[PDB]
Amino acid sequence: RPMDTEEAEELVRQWENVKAEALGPTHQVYSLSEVLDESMLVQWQTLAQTAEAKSCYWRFVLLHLEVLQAHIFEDGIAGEAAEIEALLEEAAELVDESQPKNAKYYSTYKIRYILKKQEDGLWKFCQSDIQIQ
Amino acid sequence: HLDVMMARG
């Protein structure tokens, strides 16, 4: 069955805020563990540590976020999982100082997230797959 | 090295 559209929106925007914080200048790598687990957590966690190691950071402007589809699979006492398909329109700037100019992008892309509810009532993003447009 | 597009997701 379908998940509430605003609840998927709030999950994806907390993820996007945490991504901005972890990849940002303050380098809140710990905060990734609030929203991510498993392979997605490992990937973004190594990206955050690499960025902080090379003294680069990221600035974001999230122009549009829209939940295209959202489903929840309450698989009994084994836990629950969910799948969210969202279209992101976002601009970003990598502040690196070993180059004369900072690299920027503006991208509209679809992304599917697979999340799993932990046994504490909280949701955590576990896997993701982009299709860029 | 790092590329700016690594932060989409």
3-state secondary structure of A19: helix
Contact (CB, 8 A) for A108 and A66: no
Which domain, by its residues, includes A116?
1-133
Contact (CB, 8 A) for A88 and A108: yes
Determine the straight-line distance between the first and last CA of chain A, rounded to whole angstroms. 28
* Inter-chain CB proximity A19 and B5 less than 8 Å: no
Task: State this model's resolution in angstroms.
Answer: 2.9
User: Count of domains in chain A?
Assistant: 1
Name the residue among A54, A93, A130 with its Cβ closest to that of B8.
Answer: A130
Which experimental approach was used here?
A: X-ray
Q: Which residues of A touch B (CB under 8 A)?
A: 19, 23, 44, 47, 50-51, 54, 56, 58, 60, 88, 90, 92-94, 96, 103-105, 107, 109, 111, 128, 130, 132
Q: What is the dihedral of CA A19, A23, A27, A28, to 10 degrees?
A: 10
With CA atoms as reference, report the closest residue to A52 among A86, A22, A11: A22
Q: A–B: how many Cβ contacts below 8 A?
A: 40
Contact (CB, 8 A) for A81 and A125: no
